[PDB]
Amino acid sequence: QARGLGTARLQLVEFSAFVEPPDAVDSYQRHLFVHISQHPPLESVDVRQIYDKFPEKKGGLRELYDRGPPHAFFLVKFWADLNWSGGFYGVSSQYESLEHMTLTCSSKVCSFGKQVVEKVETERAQLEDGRFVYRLLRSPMCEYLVNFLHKLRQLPERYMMNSVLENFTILQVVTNRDTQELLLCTAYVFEVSTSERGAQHHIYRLVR
Ligand SMILES: *C(=O)CCCCCCCCCCCCC
């Protein structure tokens, strides 16, 4: 059914993680580590295969999928661009719905399948052109991720970065804060891209 990352209840408009150098105040520039812009059917990947790559018990993938709805589950493979010092590291997300809601967005960093960091934010709907928009713009990246990126940047070989990234995942759960029904669940897995190629991504439906 799904052709992009979203459902009929909540569509991802844009997502990106970036850094702006200290000199961005003079001449502006931002480096994008990963970036999705949503301005045929998607491919499918069975969710059982990636269970162990995300935490267990409550808030883990199997219990989340168990809860449903199954069509709300996506996997995004990222080729991150780590080719960009004390600048600003940020994440920005924008979603769109037909109805007015208060969203709770939970993001989980997992390492070898265990939760390491979690950030939980709420966002109330804002009524715009015929539809509601939810704007979580310019969240400071947590210090864990910034230090991770700084070290990962420093590894002498790409396949080493890739081996390290094999064990690092992010799970993003968006729910209706009032009714607790799940709206969107996105599993992110990561590889490093090659210098001249910037960030790229591939989106899959998660089935069972
Ligand atoms: C810290 O801020 C806790 C959770 C943050 C979630 C944002 C993750 C966005 C992707 C970061 C880039 C990863 C590149 C390997």
CB 19 within 8 A of CB 89: yes
Crossing angle of helices 158-165 and 143-152, rounded to 10°: 150
**Which residue has 């591939």 as its token pair?**
202
Residue 151 and residue 23: Cα distance in Å, rounded?
A: 22
**Cα(139) to centroid of ligand 1, in Å?**
10
Which residues form ligand 1's pocket by a CB distance below 6 Å? 17, 33-34, 80, 91, 107, 109, 117, 119, 141-142, 145, 170, 190
SS (H, E, C) 70-97: HHHEEEEEEEECCCCCCCEEEEEEEEEE
What's the burial of 176, exposed, middle or buried (CB within 10 Å: 0-12/13-18/19+)? middle
What is the number of domains present in the chain? Answer: 1
* Model resolution, angstroms: 2.2
Tokens in use for 183?
A: 């709206």
- Residue 105's identity, in one-letter code, is C
Q: What is the CATH number of the domain that holds 167?
A: 2.70.50.80
**Cα(130) to centroid of ligand 1, in Å?**
31
Structure determination method: X-ray
Ligand 1 atom nearest residue 140's Cα: 2
Q: Which domain holds residue 68?
A: 4-208
Nearest one of 11, 1, 78 to 39, comparing CA atoms: 11
- Residue 182's identity, in one-letter code, is L
Residue 52 and residue 175: Cα distance in Å, rounded?
A: 23
All residues at 6 or more sequence positions from 149 whose CB lies less than 8 Å from its CB, including other chains: 33, 82, 89
Residue 116 and residue 93: Cα distance in Å, rounded?
A: 21
User: Residue 107 — φ and ψ, nearest 5°?
Assistant: -120, 130
